[PDB]
Every structure is written in C-alpha cells, then in structure tokens.
Amino acid sequence: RKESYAIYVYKVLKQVHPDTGISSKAMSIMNSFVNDVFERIAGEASRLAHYNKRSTITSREIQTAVRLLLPGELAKHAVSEGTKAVTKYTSAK
Amino acid sequence: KESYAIYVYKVLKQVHPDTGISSKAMSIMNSFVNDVFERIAGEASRLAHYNKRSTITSREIQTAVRLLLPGELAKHAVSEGTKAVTKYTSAR
Amino acid sequence: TRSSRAGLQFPVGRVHRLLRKGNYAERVGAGAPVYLAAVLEYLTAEILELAGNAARDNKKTRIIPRHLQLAVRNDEELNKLLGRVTIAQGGVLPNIQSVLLP
Amino acid sequence: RSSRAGLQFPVGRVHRLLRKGNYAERVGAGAPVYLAAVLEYLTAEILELAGNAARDNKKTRIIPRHLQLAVRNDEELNKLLGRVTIA
Amino acid sequence: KPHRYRPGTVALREIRRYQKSTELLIRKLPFQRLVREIAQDFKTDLRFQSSAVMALQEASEAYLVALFEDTNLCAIHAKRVTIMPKDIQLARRIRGER
Amino acid sequence: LREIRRYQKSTELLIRKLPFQRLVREIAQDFKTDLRFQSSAVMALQEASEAYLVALFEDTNLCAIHAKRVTIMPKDIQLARRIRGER
Amino acid sequence: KVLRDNIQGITKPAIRRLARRGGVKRISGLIYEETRGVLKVFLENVIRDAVTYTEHAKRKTVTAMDVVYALKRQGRTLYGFG
Amino acid sequence: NIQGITKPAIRRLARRGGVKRISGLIYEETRGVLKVFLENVIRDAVTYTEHAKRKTVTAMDVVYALKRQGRTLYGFGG
DNA sequence: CTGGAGAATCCCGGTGCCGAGGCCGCTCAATTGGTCGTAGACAGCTCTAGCACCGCTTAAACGCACGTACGCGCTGTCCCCCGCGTTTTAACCGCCAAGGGGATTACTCCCTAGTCTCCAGGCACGTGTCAGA
DNA sequence: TCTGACACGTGCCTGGAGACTAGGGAGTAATCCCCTTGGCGGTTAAAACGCGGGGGACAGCGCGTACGTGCGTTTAAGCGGTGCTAGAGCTGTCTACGACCAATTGAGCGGCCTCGGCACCGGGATTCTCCAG
C-alpha cells in the first residue's frame, strides 16, 4: 500500500483545478510539509503551554501561537478562514 | 531563592566557606542551567521520537549530549557520568 | 463523519489523530484542528494555484523543481516561516540581480 | 539518591524539572543521574572559573563584568551560547 | 565560423539554463560509494539509500545556493562581484553560528 | 582608556529612568492599549535594546572591518538584519 | 496621558558609548535615527509578541519575565532577568 | 578517496545552483565547508545508527540531521 | 553603431514507457453519550507597588566653536581564473539473481509511574560583621 | 571612605526518596526480500592538456568632512517626598469540562489494476545574440 499527507492536497487541487496532475516528489513535499508545520505549531503551543503555566493545551494557545508566527495576510486568512471555519463547526458538539 | 542557588553556593561553600556573592549572578546561572537543560531534554525527546523509540534514558541523554556538545568534555561527561551511574548502581 | 460536519475537506479525525498521537504535552485544542486545517488548506490552495498556473504557462500540468521552489517562495510570509528550510527538488529562484548579470 | 550517588548536584530536583518539562512518560533508569553528573562536570568547570575569576581582584564575587571576562574569554559554551547577554 | 562565445555567455547559460532548469547533475552511485568510503571509518557493513544520496545531492546544491547568495551579498555590499575566502567564511559566520 | 575604559568599561544601564521609561510607555501605547512606569521591566527593555545593538553593531562592525572602511552606510545594517532575518 | 517624541530617550551619547565602543570612526548623525528605526522594528517585535504573551496572561502591568519570553521567542534569550 | 568528488562537476551543480563566478581559492576551502557540514550529517547519522540497531540508514535520518542542523529538506517523508 | 545564422530553446502532437489515474469491501480507526475522570477561572481583595502625587538644582543630555581627521572615485595596472574541444578512463546505463540479514511478524523477558509514608535540607524572616555600598 | 545582606539560624515547610501496585516494550527467533556478491555488455560523464581570449579588485592621488572635545547649560530627573489603592496571587468553591468505552460505522485499507500520463520522439517553430556590418 501507499501513504502520504497529500491525497487530500490533490483533492483540494481538484476542488480548485479539476484537471491537473501531481508529481510524486510534490506529494512527499506536501507530506513532509504537513508534518513540519504540524510539529512547529504544536511546538509553539507547547511553549506557550509552559508560558501560560497551564497543564492544558486548548485552541487559545494554538490560535495565539499562529498569531505569533505569521504576521499579516496569513493572519487575514488565518482568523478569517481559520476562525470562520471554527465558527462553521463549533455551533454544535 | 527559587533557583539552582543552594547547590551552586553549596559547592561554592565547599570550595570557599566565607563567600559573599549576589542573587543576580545566581539568576544568570538559573537561566543558563535551565536553558541548556531544556535544550538537552528536548533533544532526548525528539531523539527517541525520530528513531521510533518509546524509551528515553541515559542512551538518549548520552547521544543527545553527543549531538549538542561532543568532544573531550563529552569524554569526561561519560567518564564521571557513566562511572557515577555505575557507583549509583552499586552504592545507594 | 465529523470532518464533513466541521465543514472541512481535510479529515478532522485524522488531524486529531496527529494531535493525540503527536504527544506534545487533559485535551488538545478545541477549534485548533479546524483552525490549522483551514489555514493549511488555504496556503495549500494558493501554492497549488501558483504551481498549476505557472507550470501551465509551459503547457505542463505537474510541478517541476523550478516550479516547486518558485511555488513555495512566491508567498513572502510563507517564505518568512520557511526561511531556514531546504526545498528538496527546488534548484533556484528568479532572484537575478543586475550584479548577478555577467 | 543524589548524595547516595555520591554527587554534588540533586538528581531529584533536575529530574523533577525533566518530568515537568513533559517530554515522555518513560523517564530513564539513570537518565537524570547521568545528566545531573554531566552538569555537575561542566557546572563545576564554570564554578572553578567563578572562584578564579572572583579571586581576580581579591574578591569572592564574580559580577557581569567578570562574567564578560570569563564568557568573552570562553570558547566552549560561548561557542555554544550565541544570542545570550549577561546583564 | 568557430562557434566560440563572449566572456559571460557561459555564465549567461548558467543563469538562463542553469538558473532556469533546476535538475541534479552528478551521478549518485560514485558519491554513494564515497559515503561508503567515508563511512568505513565508522562501522562495518552499513546499508544506505539511493534516496539518502539523492538527498545528499539536493542538500548539496541547495547548500551551494545559500552559500552562494550570502557570499554574493558579502561581495556586493563590499563592492565586489567575485567571491573570496573572506566572504565565504564570513558568509558562514554572519548567520550567527560563528 | 577613553575608548576601552570610558566607552567600553560601562555595562550598567545608561539612561535616566522616567524619559525612556515614557518612551516604553509611549511606543507601547502605539501598539496595544501598555508597558508602564515599570521599574525592572523597562530596564529589561533598555538592556535588551542595547544588547541587540551590541550584536547588530558587532556583526555590522565585522562587515565594516573586512570591507576596508571604518565608517558606516545603511546597507551594512540592512544586510545584518537580512542575514539574521530581521528585515 | 498624551506622549510625543521620546525617541531621543535612546540618547546620542549612549550611542557614543556603545557605537564608539565598537571602534567605528565618524559614526554619522545622518545614520543615528535609522539605527533608532532598527531599534523601532526590533523593539516593536519583542513588545509585539510580549503583549500577546501578557494578553494571554491577561495582565495589565507586565512583568519582565514576559520580556524574557519575548526575546526567547526570537532565540535572543539573555541572562540576568530570571 | 575524496577524489570521487569531481571538481568540474561540483562546478556544474554550482552553476545549476546559480553560481556566477568561482575564484581559484574557493575550491579547496569549499571542500572544507562540505567537509565539515558533511562530516556533521554523516557524524550525527552515525550517532543515530549507534543508538538504534540498524545497518540501513535512511533519507529520513538525513531529514532528522538537517532538522538538528537547520537545513531541513522535504520530499522524502517524515 | 545595428542585426541576423545558428545553436540553444520551446510547442504542440502522438503514444503508450508505465505512472497519474483507477476502484470497491472492509477494516482499523473511530462517533457519541454517560460515567468516570478532572483543571482553570470564578469574584473579591492584600499589601507591594499602581496610578495618581510633588519641588528644586545640578544630571546627563543638548548645544556652540574649534578642530580634526576619514571614505571614495577616475584611471591605470597589470592581473589569472575560465572555457573550447575532442577524448579522457574507467564509470554509466541498463540487467540480473539469489539468498542474507533488512524489514516484518512473533516470542520472550521483562514493566516503572503514582500515591503515600519518611524525612530532612531548604525558603522567608530575623542579626551582624566582615563582607557590603 | 563609610556600613549592612547573606552567613547563620529559626519557623515552616515541601519536595526528594522509597515501597507497594499493576504494569508493557525492546532484544531476538523466524520468514520473505532489496540488494551484496558476482557477472554482463554496450554507451558514456565529464574534464587533463593546450589554445584562446578578456578580466578583478584595488591603490596613487586628491577631495574632503563631521561628530567629538571643550566648555557651558539646563529643565526633567535626582533626590527627596505622598496617598489611596492597582493589581498578583491568593482566596474556596462553584462552575465547568474531558477520555474510554458501550457500541461500531465509514472512507482509507487491502487489494489489485489501468490506459493513457507525460517522456520520448516528430517535426517544426523560437530566439536572442555574438560575431558580421
């Protein structure tokens, strides 16, 4: 079998560009990229989890950590796409 | 003092029983030992993480120190550190 | 599943699996996986947009190392978050200075 | 167990900071023993530097002036600590 | 009739072709054998990856990209278009490692 | 003695507390409504600032020394901020 | 309550102490305010992530430990403040 | 046998890396630069090998090493 | 001074080399509500310092007149590392095989964190000279 | 020259230390396998040596220029001097929240494939440029 973190990446690619191919090297770029970005963000959430002196990591630490790492337009679509997406989910359980 | 105070001036009292010093340099060493401390401990954590191992012991500490600061300082570190571990394995 | 119920295209279950099995600490982030999935889906969408269109300017539909690195680096803030990274299959950038002209 | 390791520095204090640093649940069989012995070594090195550097001026105290003497004359940890200022 | 060039047209081919096309150029297997021979000083009968040595070529060329660009900046801020010992070493230094 | 001891021997903080403390207060208002008349924290701000000036002026200084100059042009601090990644 | 023009609090003779401590000669007055600009961007970065830190800590009178975490965020941790 | 490092081909991927001019002094010192950096990645690679019980190193191990050395590369997993 | 042959450089275009694409039951991960399991703020406020409180001369910055004291450009200068070019020598590309420990599955011996009891060095507070300002 | 906070000791801990108490992960045996050892053949990756050409940074020399020094000042700050409480940590707890599972259900997993994907020709079209005018 095969495994990567880019099958949903080319899914969203077909959501944006329905007739487009993908190189295998880019699939591993996306996989290593998702893991790298994940460990960085979870790292900063852990660091603030020290800083706030909580034994709990909730969404507050991650969101503010994202606010720490990316400055302006990533922040635009981060609170916009991120927070609005959280708004889209969190009305229910 | 919420620091490494008591052991630093403990051995400083072992070398100089009449010692006058300040808390500020002790805070400097507090940030130093805490800083290098979390460096080495984080290195052991990701060290066991990368090689798909669920154990962190003096091998992870040992090799982690070898990654952060090798050399003859590491040779004396495993010398007194390892022989010290041998002592603690024999004497408690 | 809850991933669709979150209004997500990315698997919220699998992302939460990265959270619990990632071991970077009673809970994990409440809205945080939705948040990160939204951001990563966004920046993913623009980088796929850049490689698809810019590569499509040469009639090709996949991403070459030139378009790999260029696709990554054409976002300035993503370049800031990835300033100390190495791009495997990247080659170079179009940063040709006039002093870089022979 | 620290004095019962015959060593100068605590294994339980440093071990408690290891645990509350929250790395993994499996703490080592002798991981804080060996780690505390290594920082016993190098901390003993910089404290011998503190005794000599304190005694530079018939004193028993190093100050950040003396810490700039030692660190700005240091190679190992001054190499290892780059972005660090002693106030 | 000899199709010889202008002094910089090779570097023009470098920027146009070699800055446009971005592929690895040195053969993986001899460098993999170099990793074997250098690896002889560590441990007997190690196995490697083709992908590890291709990663060595990738990290090698991107390494040359970073060293070349900050080496350039060290040259050009000092009003120089060529590269020296002092700008490669200083270029490595000014990151904050040295 | 002028440069080394007069210009280089001083390591204590150099500015009268209330004015630059109000610089900390003023600029701190200008981003989030506030660093205050802080006794030690404002001193940490000045110490941090001047230490950062030690770093940027020192690698800046090395860039000056190798480039056959003993004066400054802003391109040096721009390159230092570039290679550190401040810019 | 209203504060203007305190950038000269980073005084010129202090710039003589550290800048002339660096050994650089003819350190131009036309560059000092630009250096204060570098000070401006750096200090607003560390005050930036600092006020996000104490904003998470929801305190009104900021402690120096917040500044330590701020420099810590940029890897420029210094000794002598905790 | 470090002469497996073929210097004109090293110049070729230098050109591919965008290098515009190379002085004559650059070659041996660059062999020093790749010598130290390369001995770092093979070095810590060997430390990972000695801590574990494998004889087959991976490209992901090079990812781990570059993660320690601040030149992390994608495109191989991890 | 400009301006094309000509070698480096694309543009579809077909065709499958084979990889981007080709596809469904199931299973391993996994959704939902109670119990079990559980961590941080809750409003009010205490005493160090937060915000509001204040006068003068000398504190260190600001400013005037010597005065000094440093980079930077035109042009030469002779500098020197580079590239064409076929050929240079094993290495390259493509071909492979077959069991061995690599990779994987199974056996085996192991398996120390959590709570409480034991306990003793250590923290804030208080004296006082030689270390301290 | 002038003198007071940690050495030292005392309330008052409070975290090291250790023994139950269930508890689980790496070394290793065992099976297929990517390639190690050994074999194969044709094609080529790349670059010493010789010829060919321009090219790199940097000083001679001259212009030059500006903040520091010296001297003097100068109001906010130094230094001395206010007041009720701003707020940090604490106060007890409510107020409130969360994993595993009873129960299991759904898209990747497992399992295999595919047919045209885009690499390689096919032929043609760009292109810009460095040696010609």
Domains of chain H: 1-76 (1.10.20.10)
| C32-56 vs A24-51: helix crossing angle, rounded to 10 | 150
Rounded to a whole number of angstroms, the distance from the CA of D72 to the nearest CA of chain B is 15
Confirm or reject contact between G55 and chain F (CB < 8 A): yes
- In this structure, are residues B78 and B63 in contact, taking their beta carbons and an 8 Å threshold? no
Give the Cα separation of A45 and F79 in Å (integer). Answer: 32
Cβ F51–D65 below 8 Å, yes or no? no
Task: State the total domains in chain D.
Answer: 1
**Other CB atoms closer than 10 Å to residue D1's CB: what's the count?**
13
| Domain CATH code at residue A36 | 1.10.20.10
Q: Which two tokens stand for residue H69?
A: 């050395």
Whole-angstrom Cα distance, residue D81 to residue B69?
11
Other Cβ atoms closer than 10 A to E9: 12
* Tokens read off for D83: 């972005």
What are the phi and psi torsion angles at H73 (to 5°)? -115, 145
Give the number of domains in chain E: 1
| Resolution value, angstrom units | 6.3
Neighbours of chain F (3+ CB pairs under 8 A): C, D, E, G
Please tell me the distance from the alpha carbon of residue D33 to that of residue B88, in angstroms, as a whole number.
8
H40 has a chain E CB within 8 A of its CB: no
Give the Å distances, CA to CA, from H16 to D23, D38, E64, H11.
Answer: 42, 46, 9, 8
For G39, the token pair is 């000070």
Task: Give the minimum alpha-carbon distance from H74 to chain C in angstroms, rounded to a whole number.
Answer: 5
Q: Which other chains touch chain C, taking contact as 3+ CB pairs less than 8 Å apart?
A: A, E, F, H
Cβ atoms of E90 and E70 within 8 Å: the answer is no
DSSP sequence for D56-86: GGT-S---HHHHHHHHHT-SHHHHH--S--B
Mutate to test the interface with D, among F5, F11, F53 (most CBs of D within 10 A): F11
Give how many domains chain A has, as a whole number. 1
Q: CB distance from H48 to chain B under 8 Å?
A: yes
DSSP for F27-86 reads: HHHTT-----S-SSHHHHHHHHHHHHHHHHHHHHHHHHHHTT-SS--THHHHHHHHHHT-
Q: How far is B19 from chain G (nearest CA, A)?
A: 20
Q: Which domain covers residue B58, as residue numbers?
A: 23-90
A51 has a chain G CB within 8 A of its CB: yes
Q: Whole domain around residue E8: which residue ranges?
A: 2-98
SS (H, E, C) A19-82: CCCCCHHHHHHHHHHHHHHHHHHHHHHHHHHHHCCCCCCCHHHHHHHHHHHCCCHHHHHHHHHH
Inter-chain CB proximity A31 and H77 less than 8 Å: yes
CA F66 – CA E87 distance, rounded (Å): 9
Query: Rounded CA gap, C43 and C36, in Å?
Result: 11
Nearest C-alpha neighbor of A42 from the set C40, C9, C12, C18: C18
Report the residue from D6, D40, D81 with minimal CB separation from B91.
Answer: D6
User: What single-letter DSSP state applies at residue H5?
Assistant: S
**C-alpha–C-alpha distance, residues E93 and E90, integer Å:** 5
Residue C86 · residue H41 · CB < 8 Å: no
Question: Residue E40 is part of a domain; what is its CATH number?
Answer: 1.10.20.10
Contact (CB<8Å) C86/H18: no
Neighbours of H7 (CB within 10 A): 14
Q: What are phi and psi of D71, to 5 degrees?
A: -70, -40
C93 close to C70: Cβ distance less than 8 angstroms: yes
Q: How far apart are CA C84 and CA F81, in angstroms?
A: 15
The first and second tokens of residue B91, run together, are 């004497």
Name the residue type at position G69.
Answer: Y
Distance, in Å, from the CA atom of C75 to the CA atom of C85, rounded to the nearest integer, reads 14
Specify the DSSP element, H or E, that contains G41: helix G29-56
Neighbors of chain G with 3 or more C-beta pairs under 8 Å: A, B, D, F
Chain J bases closer than 7 A to any CB of the protein: 6-8, 15-18, 25-28, 35-37, 45-48, 53-59, 66-69, 76-78, 86-89, 97-100, 106-111, 117-119, 129-132
Distances (CA, A) of G30 to B20, E77, F55, G39: 47, 19, 21, 15
Nucleotides of strand I lying closer than 7 angstroms to a protein CB: 6-12, 19-21, 29-33, 37-41, 49-51, 59-62, 69-73, 80-85, 91-93, 101-103, 112-114, 121-124, 130-133
Taking the C-alpha atoms of residue B68 and residue B43, their distance in angstroms, rounded to an integer, is 8
Interface test with F, best of E73, E79, E97 (most F CBs within 10 A): E73
Within 13 Å, how many C-alpha atoms sit on residue A21's CB side? 11
- Domain with D14, as residue range(s), is 1-87
* Chain H CB contacts of A31 below 8 Å: 74, 77
Q: Report the CATH number at residue D14.
A: 1.10.20.10
- For tokens 């040709």, what's the residue? C96
- DSSP category for residue G9: G
DSSP H helices, chain B, are 5-15, 23-50, 58-68, 72-90
Q: What residue ranges in H8-77 does DSSP mark as E strands?
A: none
Cα angle for residues B68, B74, B80 (degrees, 5° grid)? 135
For the CA of C74 and the C1' of J128, the distance in angstroms is: 28
Q: Is residue B49 assigned to a domain? A: yes
Answer for the pair F42, F17: CB distance below 8 angstroms, yes or no.
Answer: yes
Contacts of C91 in chain H (CB under 8 A): 16-17
